[PDB]
Amino acid sequence: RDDNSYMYILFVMFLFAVTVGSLILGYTRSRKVDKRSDPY
Amino acid sequence: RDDNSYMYILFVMFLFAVTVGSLILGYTRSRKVDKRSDPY
Amino acid sequence: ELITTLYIGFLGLIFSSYFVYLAEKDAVNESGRVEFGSYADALWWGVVTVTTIGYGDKVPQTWVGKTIASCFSVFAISFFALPAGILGSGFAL
Amino acid sequence: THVQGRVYNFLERPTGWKCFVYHFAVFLIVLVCLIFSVLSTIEQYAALATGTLFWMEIVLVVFFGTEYVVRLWSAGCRSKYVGLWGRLRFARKPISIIDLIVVVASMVVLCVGSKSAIRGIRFLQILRMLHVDRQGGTWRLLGSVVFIHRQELITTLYIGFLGLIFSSYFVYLAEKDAVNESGRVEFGSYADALWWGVVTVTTIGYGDKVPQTWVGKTIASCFSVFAISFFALPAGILGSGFALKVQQKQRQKHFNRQIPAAASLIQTAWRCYAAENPLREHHRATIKVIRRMQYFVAKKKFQQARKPYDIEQYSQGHLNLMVRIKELQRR
Amino acid sequence: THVQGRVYNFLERPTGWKCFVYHFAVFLIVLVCLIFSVLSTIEQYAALATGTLFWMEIVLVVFFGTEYVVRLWSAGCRSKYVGLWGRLRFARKPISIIDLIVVVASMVVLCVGSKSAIRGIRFLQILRMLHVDRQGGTWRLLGSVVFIHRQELITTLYIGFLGLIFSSYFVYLAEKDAVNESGRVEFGSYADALWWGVVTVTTIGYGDKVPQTWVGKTIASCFSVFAISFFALPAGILGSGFALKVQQKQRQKHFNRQIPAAASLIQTAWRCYAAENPLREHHRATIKVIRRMQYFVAKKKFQQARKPYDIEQYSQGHLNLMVRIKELQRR
Amino acid sequence: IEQYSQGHLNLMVRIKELQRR
Amino acid sequence: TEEQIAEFKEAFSLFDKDGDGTITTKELGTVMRSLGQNPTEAELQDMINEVDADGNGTIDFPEFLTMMARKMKDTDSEEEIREAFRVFDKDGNGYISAAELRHVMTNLGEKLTDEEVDEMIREADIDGDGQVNYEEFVQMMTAK
Ligand SMILES: [Ca+2]
Ligand SMILES: [Ca+2]
Secondary structure, eight states: OSSSHHHHHHHHHHHHHHHTTTTTTHHHHHOOOSOOOOOO | SSSSHHHHHHHHHHHHHHHHHHSSSHHTTOOOSSOOOOOO | HHHHHHHHHHHHHHHHHHHHHHHHOOBBOOOSBBBSSSHHHHHHHHHHHHOOOSSSSOOEEEEEEEEHHHHHHHHHHHHHHHHHHHHHHHHHH | OOOTTTTHHHHOOOOSSSHHHHHHTHHHHHHHHHHHHSSSSTSTTSOOOOOHHHHHHHHHHHHHHHHHHHHHHHSSSOOOOOOTTGTGGGSSHHHHHHHHHHHHHHHHHHHTTTTTTTTHHHHHHGGGGGTOOOTTTTHHHHHEEEHHHHHHHHHHHHHHHHHHHHHHHHHHHHHSBBBOTSOBBBBOOOHHHHHHHHHHHTTOOSSSSSOSSSHHHHHHHHHHHHHHHHHHHHHHHHHHHHHSTTHHHHHHHHHHHHHHHHHHHHHHHHHOOSSSOHHHHHHHHHHHHHHHHHHHHHHHHHTTSSSOOOOOOOOSSTTTHHHHHHHHHHH | OOTTTTTHHHHSOOHHHHHHHHHHHHHHHHHHHHHHHHHSSTTSSSSSOOHHHHEEEEEEHHHHHHHHHHHHHHTOOOSOTTTTTGGGGGGGGGHHHHHHHHHHHOOOOOOOOHHTTTHHHHHHHHHHGTTSSSSTTTTHHHHHHHHHHHHHHHHHHHHHHHHHHHHHHHHHHHHOOOOOTTSSSSSSSHHHHHHHHHHHHHTTTOOOOOOSSHHHHHHHHHHHHHHHHHHHHHHHHHHHHHHHOOOOOHHHHHHHHHHHHHTTTHHHHHHHHHTTTOOSSSSHHHHHHHHHHHHHHHHHHHHHHTSOOOOOOOOSTTHHHHHHHHHHOOO | OOOOOSTTTTTTHHHHHHHHH | OEEEEEEHHHHHHHTTSSSSOOOOOOHHHHHHHHHHHOOOHHHHHTHHHHOOSSSSSSSSSSSSHEEEEEESSSTTSOOOOOOOOTTTOOSSOOOOOOOHHHHHTTTTOOOOOOOHHHHHHTTTTTTTOOOHHHHHHHGGGOOO
C-alpha cells in the first residue's frame, strides 16, 4: 500500500539536491578560472 | 514472545552509558579551560 | 575518536530507531504478524541495520518508516564503519 | 562574586573529581528513568511502570526547572555576557536552547496529563540524554572534520547518488511486471525500486526485494560493485580525518605547556643576574640562595616541557639532523 | 565584444552571487519536474500528473532550445575556438554533446506524442540533472584518482573476480541438485550460483539463495572472508586517493597566490629605489610619498601570502630547522 | 604525487646559499 | 635627521590642501589620482590600514613619520626581499636570466614600464650572461 509513498521520492531527491547545491556553490564561490597561468 | 526482553534495553543503554561515562571523565580529568590564552 | 563515534552512532541509534517505532507501532506483515511490536523489536532493528547486517526479519512496511530508515541508514552506517579504519591505522602504526 | 564564580565552574565546563559524580549520577538517573519509561511498551512488562514513575518524572522536572535557573543566575561570571540583558546571548548556546525546550515542554506535557498523553514523555525523556554531555566537545570535532573534507564527501555522495538514481531506474524498467514466488509483485513502483537502491547501495540486503528477471540481476551486479565502493568511501575518509584532528590538538596542547615553562626560565634567569641591587644587607644575603634554588626547578620544568613529546617516536626523520647542525655550529 | 564576453562568464564557468541563483533555480526546476514526472507511476498519485505537466515540459524544452543557442553564440570569446567552423570543437565538450542529445531528443519525443510515449520523457528528464553541474569538476577528480591508483585497483579486482569465478563454481558443484525448504531448487544453473557469488562477495546477502548442503557452506565461508577483504579494498584506496588530490590542489592554489604578492614587492622596491629620475620638480615631490606608501601594503600582502599556510600545522617536522640555519648563517 | 617537496621547500636552497658564503 | 624633520611636515599635510594635521586618506584618493594613479577605494582604504599604525585614517605623523623612519635597508627587510627571488629560483644559485627576469617583470603583480624594466636588469647583468644574481641586486638595493 502506497499511503505516504510521496515521502521517499521527496526525501531522496532532496538529499541529492543538497549534494548538488554544495557543488554549484563550490564553483560559484571559486576565485579564478585562469586555465594556463599557474607555472609561468 | 517477550520473555527476556528486558535484557536488550538493559544492554544497549549500558553500552551507551559506557560511551558517555568516558566522555564526562574525559572532561573532568581535563587540565585547563582557558578559552583565549593560547597564542598570546 | 572511538568514544566520539560510538557516542554519535549510539545517539543516532537511540533517536532514529524510536521514530520508526512511532511510524510502525500498529502495522502487520505480509504473513499476519506485527514486526515492530515493542521498542525492543525496533531497537533490535536499529542495531541490526546500523551494523549493515540486514537479516530481513523486520523491514518497515509503512512508507513513513522507510524514509527514516534510509536517512538513519546512511548517516549512521558511516559512523559505525569508522572504527575499522581507525584501528587499521592504529595497528600498523 | 566568589559566591557565584565557583558555581559556574561546578555546573558548566566542570572540573574536579566530584563534578564527575554530579554530572554522571544525574545521567544515571535519566538512564534508569528512560529504561523504565520504555519497558512500558512491551505489553507484558507494562505493570512495572506505575504512577510513581510519573511522580518521579514530576520531581525530575522540578529538579531541572531550578537547575536551569541556577545555571542562568550563575552565568554573570563571564566576560562574554553580564547582567540580565547580556545573558540572553548565553541562551543562544544551542545546548541551552535544547535544555529550555526539554524542561518547559516536559512541564507543559505533565500539566495537561494531570488535570497519547504519556507517549509524549518518551521523546522528552530521550532528549535529556543530549543535555548532560556539556561543552559540545564531540559535535565540534565532527562538524570540522566534515568541513575540512567537504570536497571528497560531496564528490562521492554525488557519484553514489547519481548511480543510485540512474541504475535503480533500469531495474524498474527490467522488473515492472514480474511476480514473486509467493504471488506478489516486488518492483511495483519507482519508490519500491529506489528503496531497493538505497538498501543495496548500503549493503544491507534485507531480502524483501530481489530482482527476479535475469536482465535485472546483471544491472544489480554492476551497480552493486560500482556503487558499494563509493558509499563505503566516507568511512575511510572520516577515519583519517578524526585521527588527524586529535593529533592536531595534542600539538597545540603541548605547545601551551611549553610556553609557561619557557617563560619561567628566562624570568628567573634575569632574577638570578639581578643580584647587584633589588640594616638592609642580610636580607639580601638570603635572596641569593632562593634565586639559585628555584632556577634549577625552572630548569627541570623546561626540560620536562620539551623532552616528553606526546606517538612519541616522531624523531625518525631527523635522528642525526638535530645533532649534525650543532656540532657543525660549534666549529 | 563586451556585449558577448560577459555572457560567457554568466553561463559557463560561472561566478558571482547571482550565477548561483541562476544555475541552482534552474536545477530546482528540473528537480520538481522530475519528482512530478516520477510520482505518476505510483498508480494512486497518478492523478497529479495532468497535461499541464506536459506543457510545462514543452516550455522547458523551449527554454533549453534557446539556452543551447545562447551558449553556442557566446562561445566565440575563447582563444581555443573562434567564428563558426572553430566552434564545432566547442561541441566536442561532452557536457555539450549530452546537452544537445537532451534538448533535441526530448523535442523529438514531444513532437510525436502531440500529433510508451510518455515513458521516454522520464529518461530524458533524468538526464537533465547531469548538464547543470558545469565544468566537469567532479569526474575529473575521479578519473585521475583511478588512473593514479590503476595498479592496486586492477590487482584487487583481478584477485576478487578470480575468487568469484573459481569458488562460485565449487558451490554449484556442491549444490547442483538440492531443493529449498519450499520445494524449489536454488542453484539450478551456473548463473544462479554466480548471482550468488556477486551478491555474497559484496556483502549484500539478500537471502534468496543460501547453500543448503553442508559442503557448500564451508566453501561459502572460505570464499566469504577471503574475497570480502579484496572487494572492500577499493573503498580505502580511493579514500586515501581523494583526500590526497585535494591537498595537492591546495598546494598549487596557494602557490598561485604567492607569486603575484612576490611580484608586487620586487616591482615596488625597484620603484622605491628609482627616486633619482622617473616646473617638473614638485610633481616629483609627491611620488616619494606614494612609492613608500604602497610598498608597505605590498609588504603586508607578501607576509600574508606565506604565513597563512592552508591542516595549517605542517611545520611539525621542521620546527627549529627553519631558524637553526638562519642563526648559523648570521655568524 | 610529484609534490613531495612540501617539507623541504626552502631547505634545499637555505644550505646552498650558506655554502656559497 | 635634524634637517629633514621640519620640511617633511610641509609635504605631510600637502594632500589635504589645508593646514590641518591630517594625512587625508579620503583626499589621498584625489591626490594620487591627480598624480596619475587613480586606484580603487578598496586599495585606498588598505593604504592607511597598515601605513597609519594609529588606526583613524588621518594623522599628525605618529606613523607617517615612522613610515619615513623605516629605511627598508637594514637586515630586517633585506632578507624578505631576498626571499622574493627565492620564489622564482629554479635549480638553485639564483639562475635568473635576463629573459626570465623580463618575463616576470612585465607580467605579474604591479607591472613596470618597458623603459623601466628594460634597464632594470642592466646593472644586474654587467657580465652579460644569463644569470642576474640576487646578491648583485640587493647590493644595489642596499641603499634603498
Ligand atoms: Ca582630514
Ligand atoms: Ca590614526
